[PDB]
Design an enzyme around this catalytic site. Sequence first.
Site, PDB file in Angstrom:
ATOM      1  N   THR A   1       5.845  27.823   1.274  1.00  0.00           N
ATOM      2  CA  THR A   1       7.035  27.894   0.435  1.00  0.00           C
ATOM      3  C   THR A   1       7.111  26.680  -0.482  1.00  0.00           C
ATOM      4  OG1 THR A   1       8.382  29.263   1.927  1.00  0.00           O
ATOM      5  CG2 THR A   1       9.565  27.800   0.422  1.00  0.00           C
TER       6      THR A   1
ATOM      7  N   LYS B   1      13.343  33.653  -3.425  1.00  0.00           N
ATOM      8  CA  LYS B   1      13.901  32.489  -2.751  1.00  0.00           C
ATOM      9  C   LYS B   1      14.908  31.707  -3.586  1.00  0.00           C
ATOM     10  CE  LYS B   1       9.350  32.081  -0.586  1.00  0.00           C
ATOM     11  NZ  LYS B   1       8.174  31.208  -0.316  1.00  0.00           N
TER      12      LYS B   1
ATOM     13  N   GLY C   1      18.266  27.188  -3.479  1.00  0.00           N
ATOM     14  CA  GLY C   1      17.055  27.612  -2.805  1.00  0.00           C
ATOM     15  C   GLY C   1      16.952  26.955  -1.448  1.00  0.00           C
TER      16      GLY C   1
ATOM     17  N   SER D   1       6.796  23.354   1.806  1.00  0.00           N
ATOM     18  CA  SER D   1       5.532  22.797   2.278  1.00  0.00           C
ATOM     19  C   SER D   1       4.649  22.337   1.123  1.00  0.00           C
ATOM     20  CB  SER D   1       4.794  23.822   3.142  1.00  0.00           C
ATOM     21  OG  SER D   1       4.321  24.908   2.363  1.00  0.00           O
TER      22      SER D   1
ATOM     23  N   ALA E   1       0.611  26.346  -5.748  1.00  0.00           N
ATOM     24  CA  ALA E   1       0.174  27.570  -5.083  1.00  0.00           C
ATOM     25  C   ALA E   1      -1.322  27.549  -4.795  1.00  0.00           C
ATOM     26  CB  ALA E   1       0.542  28.788  -5.930  1.00  0.00           C
TER      27      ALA E   1
ATOM     28  N   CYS F   1      -1.426  24.748  -1.663  1.00  0.00           N
ATOM     29  CA  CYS F   1      -0.720  24.969  -0.408  1.00  0.00           C
ATOM     30  C   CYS F   1      -1.062  26.349   0.145  1.00  0.00           C
ATOM     31  CB  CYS F   1       0.788  24.832  -0.627  1.00  0.00           C
ATOM     32  SG  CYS F   1       1.813  25.104   0.830  1.00  0.00           S
TER      33      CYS F   1
ATOM     34  N   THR G   1       1.954  28.836   0.126  1.00  0.00           N
ATOM     35  CA  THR G   1       2.597  29.093  -1.157  1.00  0.00           C
ATOM     36  C   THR G   1       1.678  29.968  -1.996  1.00  0.00           C
ATOM     37  OG1 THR G   1       3.789  26.978  -1.080  1.00  0.00           O
ATOM     38  CG2 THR G   1       3.573  28.049  -3.226  1.00  0.00           C
TER      39      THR G   1
END
Lengths: 172, 173, 173, 172, 173, 172, 173, 173, 172, 173, 173
Positions: I1, I34, I46, I124, I157, I160, I163
């Site tokens: 996330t 989110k 969020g 994260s 993205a 992670c 993500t």
Amino acid sequence: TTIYAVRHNGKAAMAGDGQVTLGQQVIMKQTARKVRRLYEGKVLAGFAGSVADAFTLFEKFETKLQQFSGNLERAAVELAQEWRGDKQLRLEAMLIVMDKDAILVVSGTGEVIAPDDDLIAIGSGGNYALSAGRALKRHASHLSAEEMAYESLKVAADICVFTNDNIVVETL
Amino acid sequence: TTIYAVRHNGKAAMAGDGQVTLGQQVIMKQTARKVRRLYEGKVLAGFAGSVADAFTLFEKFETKLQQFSGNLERAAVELAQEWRGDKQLRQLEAMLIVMDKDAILVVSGTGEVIAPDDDLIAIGSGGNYALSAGRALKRHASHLSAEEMAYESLKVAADICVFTNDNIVVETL
Amino acid sequence: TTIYAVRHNGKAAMAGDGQVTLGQQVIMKQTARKVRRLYEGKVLAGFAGSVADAFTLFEKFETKLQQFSGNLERAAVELAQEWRGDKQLRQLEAMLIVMDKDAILVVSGTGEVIAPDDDLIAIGSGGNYALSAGRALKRHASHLSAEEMAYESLKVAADICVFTNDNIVVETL
Amino acid sequence: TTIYAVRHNGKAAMAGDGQVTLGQQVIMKQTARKVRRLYEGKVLAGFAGSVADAFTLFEKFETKLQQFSGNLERAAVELAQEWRGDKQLRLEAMLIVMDKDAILVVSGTGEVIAPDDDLIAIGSGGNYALSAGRALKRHASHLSAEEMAYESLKVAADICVFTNDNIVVETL
Amino acid sequence: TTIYAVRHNGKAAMAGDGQVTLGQQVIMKQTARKVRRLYEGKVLAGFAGSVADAFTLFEKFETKLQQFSGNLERAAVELAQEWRGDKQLRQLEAMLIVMDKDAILVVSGTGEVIAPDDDLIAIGSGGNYALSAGRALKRHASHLSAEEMAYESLKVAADICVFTNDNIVVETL
Amino acid sequence: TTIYAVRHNGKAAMAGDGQVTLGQQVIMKQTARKVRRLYEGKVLAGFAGSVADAFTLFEKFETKLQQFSGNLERAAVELAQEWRGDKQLRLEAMLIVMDKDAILVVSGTGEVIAPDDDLIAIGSGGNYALSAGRALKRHASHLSAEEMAYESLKVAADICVFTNDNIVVETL
Amino acid sequence: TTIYAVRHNGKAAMAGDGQVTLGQQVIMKQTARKVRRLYEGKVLAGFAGSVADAFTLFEKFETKLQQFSGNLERAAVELAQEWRGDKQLRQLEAMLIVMDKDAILVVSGTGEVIAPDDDLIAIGSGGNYALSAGRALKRHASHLSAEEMAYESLKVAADICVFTNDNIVVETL
Amino acid sequence: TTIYAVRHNGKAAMAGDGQVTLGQQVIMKQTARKVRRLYEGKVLAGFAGSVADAFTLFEKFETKLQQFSGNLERAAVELAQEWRGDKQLRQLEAMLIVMDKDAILVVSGTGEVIAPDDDLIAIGSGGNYALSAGRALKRHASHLSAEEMAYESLKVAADICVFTNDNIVVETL
Amino acid sequence: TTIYAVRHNGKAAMAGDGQVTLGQQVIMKQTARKVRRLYEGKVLAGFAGSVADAFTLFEKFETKLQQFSGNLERAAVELAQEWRGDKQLRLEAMLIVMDKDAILVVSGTGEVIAPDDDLIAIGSGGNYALSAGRALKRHASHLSAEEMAYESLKVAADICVFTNDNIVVETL
Amino acid sequence: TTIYAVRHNGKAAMAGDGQVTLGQQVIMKQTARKVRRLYEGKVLAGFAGSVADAFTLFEKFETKLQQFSGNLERAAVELAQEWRGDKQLRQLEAMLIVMDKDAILVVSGTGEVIAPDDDLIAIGSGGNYALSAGRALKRHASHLSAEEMAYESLKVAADICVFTNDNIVVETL
Amino acid sequence: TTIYAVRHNGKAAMAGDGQVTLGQQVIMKQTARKVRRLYEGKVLAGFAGSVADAFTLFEKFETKLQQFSGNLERAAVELAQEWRGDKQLRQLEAMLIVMDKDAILVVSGTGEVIAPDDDLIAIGSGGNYALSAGRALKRHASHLSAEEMAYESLKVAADICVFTNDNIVVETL
């Protein structure tokens, strides 16, 4: 497991139970023989661990006895410092040895202990047989060494979940 | 894993399942053969553990038998002491089952060499359940053969233990 | 501790040993009676834990047996959600076993309620050993009564489990 | 700590040592009195924990006895389920109670145990006094209950590092 | 990481993703090629661990393939007992997968050697997800080739496993 | 610590900070030089651990390069399997090496990783410089390799408590 | 265990108790003698650990006393770096105490060598209690001999430490 | 323990306390001398750690100096690499401080060789407090000599750290 | 996330990914939303945790905003001390809120943080989008807030594992 | 975080850094102001923990300052027993620092209330480093004002503590 | 912290040190007053622990004394039971020392209420060392007054315990 030794009135005895336990939970054998004769039958030995480790230490203790002409204490001491010296055997089970003159207990922690009252025990129920053996020596001295060793094991057997009443008594 | 040996009515039989489990959660094989014949068909052996460890301990044991003149008891103890000393082969978890026409033995990674009083015993995660069934069968169903007792005891263990299936293979001496 | 129940051939039995262990090492009692009769003698119950918790759950289950016209299954389920709902008894690792003339049930601290597929089940330290013996006897020794089955299953468990002795009391319904 | 109780030949006794230990390492007192008289002197009680917890349970057990007309077992059982019910007292020290007819042990784990042979013990050295008490009951039945309780404590005292030989024996 | 092998309809394939993860959190590479061709192009192999250990085991396995006349099963077993015998690689939690034209094998740090019952198996973080997809495709989509099966199985695993991406390289034999 | 390397427009660069931290809590030095020149100045190396371990691996990597005629990947791979082979060095700090053609990262876990986009980083703040370096390569390609390496370290320095802004940039 | 040494008013003494404890719970011996005379009776030594380790270190220290012309301080230091250098005795938590007519020294598994500032020091479970008693007696009861000081210091420790009894043996130099 | 070295105004000084602590709770000595002179009075060295480990690392360092022609920096790095490899001498906890008339260095058991930018640094449990005082003194109290700064910085550390006392000994080159 | 917010050139934006992970190992959803609109569409919120906890905090933050007339900081502070006050919610996921004037991050540890450069992130991979957002704000200020938020999420993205690149961007 | 208070030469000052760290690794803010003015500007207070807890304790302390006629010492003590009495804030490891024109006090989650012996004290990650700098400046640089002392003490801590930066705000009384 | 009470020769004295330690490593105060007078100067009390916990337990104890008519023994037990029940005030670590002209008592957080047989006892991290010194002094130095014994016993404890200093304050009844 409980192995109890006692010198009383010129007679020496060592008794052991027969239970073998795996993982502190399940019984695998009821008729094991844990008291062995060493050094031309002049030493009664016992080990509270596995039979492979018992036989390994029994062999090393026999050569030490032959090296020192049956000096139980000197053989036990150098076995203990050799025992701690080993990578694998350095083990929390204890060894008990006994000739006509002395009793000794040898632990993997390097402790060599002679009892003050000519009686001592090892194993998970050893302190229970030791407790009964001391009451017997003080208040039932009419019993023989073999009788004392048998009754002490039987007391520990009804208390310790890892000690059964298939008790064998050996005399020197 | 459950391996079970029983000597009954003049016959010897050793049964085992076929499930191989990794991470105590996932099944990778259902038809493994865990009961092996050793010493020119005179010894039935099985191993709760891995394949490479089984073959290693199988070879050291057969070597011990040739050196000790087929003495199962003396070879099992010497193998046990050798097993404890080897820091690379030392598995407190693993256990070994061996059987000839005379005796049955279990060699522990903890160093214990046990001979069953009633000539039946088992190893593996579900061994105590097969041991329970086999004892009941030897007492109240003595009409069953040794290979029948071996299969039925494994079948009971399989329906209780999550690491033991019903793909049971029975070897008779 | 081992408690084993079996409904076989129109009979019902529940047996338990007598050993009480403290600290998983020392025996304090050998002749304990862990099978208690409930609900005007129409229900047998057993608890694998301590005496105080056994009585607490026995009285609560007896209450809900009056509350539900003696319906074992529904009394067991709502006892299970109250057991889990109590901050006290939620931490109990022991299980409860109940039976009447028609059903056997096991209730756990997990919130479990299990009816055995073959009208036989066990609880306690060696329950799985008595369960294996009972299933083997159910299949190959069906001539035995429920009273002999429960008794023989407990002795098999007693010879394997270090927390189970041979002082077995069989209460029949 | 060791507290041992025994009914023998119509005589009931309970003995305790006097040692108090802090942090399982240091001795803070040698003359503690751990056996108390309850319920008009018809109950001998003992607790292997702290004096604040002992007095709290002694009080709750007295009201239970008065509630049930001296039913030792029923008072002990409801004390045990009340004991487990408490957030704070739910403690691994054990309680021992004894009237003229029965002996009981109550643990924080909710166990209510009556001995099979009219003798039982609690504390860190309780299994040692229990071991000697059983050998004495079988091989020295000529001893009184008070003598048996004293010798069992003395045996456990020479074994347990947390149990001294300042033994007081109370009789019913 | 996910590596999946399948021998289906006279064809053999092995596929792997390309994601490299450090600390189970961060991606360092997306286009890694984890399927390596061994033994004069007659063997496909994959390792779920690090590159250094993959090469170390690849060269040792290639040695024993020459040593045993290209016998996969026996080369795998003795590699397994040497792997366990090394104080280095004994601590490796990853597994090794090998295949030729006739057999598929998985070797582990546990000492395991497994031949799949249905000529398909997988290793890595999402191996069990590709294994499930492969078994479903083997039963209800048997028209797909081994190359499409291994590729489609990896994409299913990639959409579930956070340590497996869609940069899939299918090496056919 | 953060060490970031990037090849961009025929120019190669590697930047590092100067902070040295003890026990993950205290700063002991602010002006450390973590980027070293190896193999006749044709390799830029960096290590996220201690200087004794860095120099040990730098030496072993130089002999591997001389053994393989500057094959960066083959030298790194055999260093990694030699690194894992050592009892002592088998350490969670990572190594970064870079010649005119390739960039590599070598971890104590035996991972040898070449970046997909000719940029990579190591250290406690390496993922932060990697994050800024990728945004710079896509949205600020007018920057040189040396400028990119400097700005990425500076971004990671304001985020990572173990990375300061005493940034030195080396170019091949 | 408690061993206390004191050089006071031209006299030297070392005293120890006799209790041997296993598992920090059970007493196995009450009359042990832990003060041993070394180097032709010119050195008193004591070890707070097991008998096997005590003898091992006693013989090694006796060797280096011959090796260094009876120089306690230098024999102690090189014994300390060999003690730490041994993979065996490095794990020992107990300490060693040595004294001659002129110096007192304590050697540890930490590699420590300490000469007390006031010619008195102790080791073992209750050494700090005997040390406190000895320092109070050194300041306010300086009329006592070294033999009475070491004896009285041990009895104070014996009444506080559960691992130290009153079976005290005072060896004077 | 706190040892602190400072080079100021053409003089070099290294101070240390005298407290020796065991088990992080008990004091056994208050007047130890932790600052030693090496290399024929040209090197001032101290060691946060034990005596036997100090003398061992002191000897290896002087040997390194004779082999590297008095080069403190090259000897410190070579000693650091030697220290990390030796599995018996490897102490992540311990640290070494050395100083000649030109440079100051700290050798970590973690392998770090640090040269202070401001020509002052400290080791030991209270070293960062003496480091804080010394930095403040070099900035706002430059009139103090090097041995005065060394003493005052140790005095501040002693009143804060429980493992450092005020029995401070200052050695000047 | 990862949820990243940035005010830039009078425009405010907040972007989030869509991946939902169970047990830090398996992906259960790829298209989660989110970023939520609160307080008559004048606040972009969020949460990096579960949707049940997100909706619970979103509701409590809305009543705080209505209580304080849209004072973002005062509402966040009393939410944080109420959040820490709860037995159940006292949770390591963080909250991010943003109106036309300020950005804030609220953690379960009671931290209320306004960014120094009008950009911040949670989750994260938040530090990775924060790293790219800062390089973009300094070296690519020609991008809009919505473009900046999208590119920062896309950078995080690819780094992670928790993500994904199903990025939705909301503007105030 | 570091907050340092000092009453020196008829002046009072309290300084704090601005760095906010999450997870002991990442910086989220650099210009935080952790010194807040309380009780009609007559009291300076600082908290080493989170903002939510800082405000909660600030308002409670402000309440008891009105409740006790502005008596710092008694307001601090009853705040300390309420802080410990709350099941919430009992688990807080951070400490609180308060000062007025006449006294400095530190309150902890331990229930501690400490008045410094020399009218200077600090809290936070690098408080002991600023404390050492402040004590050295108090003794050898007494010409500095309280505002310069608190500022200079914080910069020393900022150069050692990784959780303390140089964005220092000095609030004087 | 070390607090020590002794009744000797018709006088009662209670001594304590002044060191306040946080995190078992750092000193924050050297001149604290830990021995307080209660019950209108008739009770001397001290507390090993924090200030807020001391004042809380001091108030509950004085309340217990007024309710129990100055009975120290009955108030100490009732306070002990109250202390164990309160989940917010329950400190197994903390201990309380009280003394009037007749008796001495120690109240444990473990619930123990101990009366010393020899009318001397101590609490705190260094209490057993002061206890050892005091016993030696009462035996071989009975000529010392009670306040002299209290000071000398604290002085011995301070030179051994790292958490106890020599800033000793003695209060006499």
